[PDB]
Amino acid sequence: PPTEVIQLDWWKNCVLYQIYPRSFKDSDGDGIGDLKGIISELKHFVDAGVDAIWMSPIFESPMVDFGYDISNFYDIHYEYGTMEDFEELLDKAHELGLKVLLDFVPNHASNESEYFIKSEAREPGYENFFIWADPLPNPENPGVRLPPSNWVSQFGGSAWEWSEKRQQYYLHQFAIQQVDFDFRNPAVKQEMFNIMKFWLDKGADGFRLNALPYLIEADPADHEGRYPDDPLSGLTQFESHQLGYTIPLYTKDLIELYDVVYEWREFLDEYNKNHGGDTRVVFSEGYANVSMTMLYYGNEDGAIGAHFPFNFDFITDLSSKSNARDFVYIILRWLTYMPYGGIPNWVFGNHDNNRMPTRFRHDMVDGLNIINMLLPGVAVTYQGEEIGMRDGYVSWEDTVDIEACNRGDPDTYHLYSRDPARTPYHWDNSTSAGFSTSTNTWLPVAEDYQEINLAKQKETARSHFKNYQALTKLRKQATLSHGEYDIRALSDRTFYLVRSLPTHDTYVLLFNVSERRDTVDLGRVPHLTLPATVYVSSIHSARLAGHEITSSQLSLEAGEALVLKAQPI
């Protein structure tokens, strides 16, 4: 008979959906998505088979970086709604069985925060809240003010801004208006516990931890009392105001940042012990090399950090230039490097990167969602991947991403702009794809909404959405929660992923990631006994769900993906 299995803790195999609240659902016609919008479509997550939602920032913000510049970490941004709307969202989401995670932005605060206003004024308790530094002594040319170091902002220009009021530079690794906290300040670290405790006390199930690689910079005590220059990249194409001019040796991935993360986890473990109910969790966001990335989980010496760091490998290391061997070899990187008992996770997109079908190909949407849902651990979905949304066209004139406005111009803005991945969600074929009742939206609705929208995918017989639902349904099967995984390339074109578990059904992904047809021998696929049944097929496959596979020779079209259901091992 099929063996009994114990249910995993929710966070070990959740489908996690990232909401970009500004682009999800406008409830009031201002062209701006809001909490009442999210509340009205919470049923969408149940329908989709999502377990957990994480929202991009909803806290009081001047919106310079659309929420990542927070002026009050304890209240809701007025365009999105009120604290009461937030409490209603949690209550309704929890009533539906969903978990809700918030975007925690610990690195930096708005220059409109009381933190920064108090700090610029050298108020007791706040004077050393941020990184304040003197001009670099300029004995040659003493009438010329030099910044503390050559450090470059992620958004272009110096990371140092002169304060006329304080007569000192402050550090901003992001926008001039995003001021870096001093994470060597015990008062700063205590304020971070206070912010997390507040939202946990409201009933948040956890947090996405933003931009952790930038937390800590070089102590001038270690550099003869100056901020040390970052080494030069030596790349001819970058001048001193351009991101790439430096290698961030003193400004990114400092070992001390991880001690802050392990302190957060210690705080969270204590909170969970003292509140019970379902485990509250932290997922860390940082782009770094595999070694620095795995230190977020914990270290050799027994430190425990984030429940997991996000795996951005499907954003940074795979694309439409990748073959089946590339896919397998990148999937193996997380599984080879992850610490013993670490929980794997998979991310195909977010609000900072081109949409999944734009980075890959429109014909690859189903295969990519299948990989996400069938790999062991946690599937992460970015708003619109469940319906195969493409980047929207955004003109220079409609561009509002500070990164593009700062680093770019009319000819180069598209190199930097994150706006094409933030265009409003495609609910239906109504005005503005049902995002808003208005033709005025904060970013232009993508031109293809008549072809790519949720309502159409629910009506039509075969759709990206229906495939999404069938895969999130399959994750409730013991073979996907508890089963072994085997992954290998059959050719440069096609790989398999097999989930198997004695006495339970076997499930096999076959994915042709290439631009050409491929014929493979299913005899090489471990645990695949024929005949087998198509469980899911890409929307243009020759095979419909229910199709029986009887021959060992299988021809796949470019982009074609199948999930087969086979008799138990």
Ligand X SMILES: OC[C@H]1O[C@@](CO)(O[C@H]2O[C@H](CO)[C@@H](O)[C@H](O)[C@H]2O)[C@@H](O)[C@@H]1O
Residue 197 Cβ, how far from a copy of itself at the closest point, in Å?
A: 33
Of 38-46, 288-296, 345-353, 499-507, the window that binds a copy of itself (rule: CB under 8 A) is: 288-296
Cis, peptide link before residue 339, omega less than 30° from 0: no
Is the distance from CB of 38 to CB of 23 less than 8 angstroms? Answer: no
Phi, psi for 205 (deg, rounded to 5)? -90, -5
Q: How many CB atoms lie within 10 A of CB 368?
A: 26
Phi, psi for 562 (deg, rounded to 5)? -130, 145
Element at 35 (helix H, strand E): helix 35-40
- Was 492 annotated as part of a binding site? no
- Was 136 annotated as part of a binding site? no
Of 30-38, 118-126, 511-519, 548-556, the window that binds Mg ion (rule: CB under 5 A) is: 30-38
Using the rule CB under 6 A, which residue among 211, 268, 295, 563 binds ligand X?
211
121 makes contact with a copy of itself (CB under 8 A): no
Using the rule CB under 5 A, which residue among 65, 79, 180, 366 binds Ca ion?
180
Name which of 236 and 274 has its Cβ closer to a copy of itself. 236
The Cα 351–Cα 401 span in angstroms is: 11
251 makes contact with ligand X (CB under 6 A): no
Residue 109 Cβ, how far from ligand X at the closest point, in Å?
A: 11
Query: Could you give the maximum distance between any two Cα atoms of the chain, in Å?
Result: 84
- Was 301 annotated as part of a binding site? no
Under DSSP, is residue 439 helix (H, G, I), strand (E, B) or coil? coil
The Cα 72–Cα 362 span in angstroms is: 40
- Was 107 annotated as part of a binding site? yes
Element at 310 (helix H, strand E): none
The Cα 422–Cα 442 span in angstroms is: 10
Looking only at residues 169 through 198 of this chain, which bind ligand X when binding is defined by CB under 6 A? 174
Name which of 143 and 234 has its Cβ closer to a copy of itself. 234
- Was 352 annotated as part of a binding site? no
Looking only at residues 344 through 363 of this chain, which bind ligand X when binding is defined by CB under 6 A? 351-352
Is the distance from CB of 258 to CB of 296 less than 8 angstroms? Answer: yes
- Kindly give, in sequence order, each residue whose CB lies less than 8 Å from that of residue 118, ignoring residues fewer than 6 positions away: 125, 126, 129
Tracing tokens 């659309």 back to the chain, one arrives at 66
Nearest-CA neighbor of 50 among 525, 529, 274, 372? 372
Name which of 274 and 336 has its Cβ closer to a copy of itself. 336
Residue 107 Cβ, how far from Ca ion at the closest point, in Å?
A: 5
Residue 336 Cβ, how far from a copy of itself at the closest point, in Å?
A: 5
Is the distance from CB of 20 to CB of 32 less than 8 angstroms? Answer: no
- The pairing of strands 532-537 and 561-566 is antiparallel
Of 24-32, 256-264, 298-306, 544-552, the window that binds Mg ion (rule: CB under 5 A) is: 24-32
300 makes contact with a copy of itself (CB under 8 A): yes
Decide which of Ca ion, ligand X, a copy of itself, none touches 393; Cβ closer than 5 to 8 Å per partner kind: none
The Cα 274–Cα 139 span in angstroms is: 58
- Was 32 annotated as part of a binding site? yes
Amino acid, res. 90: L
Looking only at residues 91 through 130 of this chain, which bind ligand X when binding is defined by CB under 6 A? 105
> Binding-site residues for Mg(2+), please?
26, 28, 30, 32, 34
Q: Which residues bind a copy of itself (CB under 8 A)?
A: 232, 234-237, 290-291, 294, 300, 323, 325, 328-329, 332-333, 336-337, 340, 488-493, 524
Q: Which residues bind Ca ion (CB under 5 A)?
A: 107, 180, 214-215
Binding residues: 26, 28, 30, 32, 34, 107, 180, 214-215, 217
Binding residues for Ca(2+): 107, 180, 214-215, 217
Residues that bind ligand X (CB under 6 A): 65, 68, 105, 154, 174, 210-211, 285-287, 351-352, 403
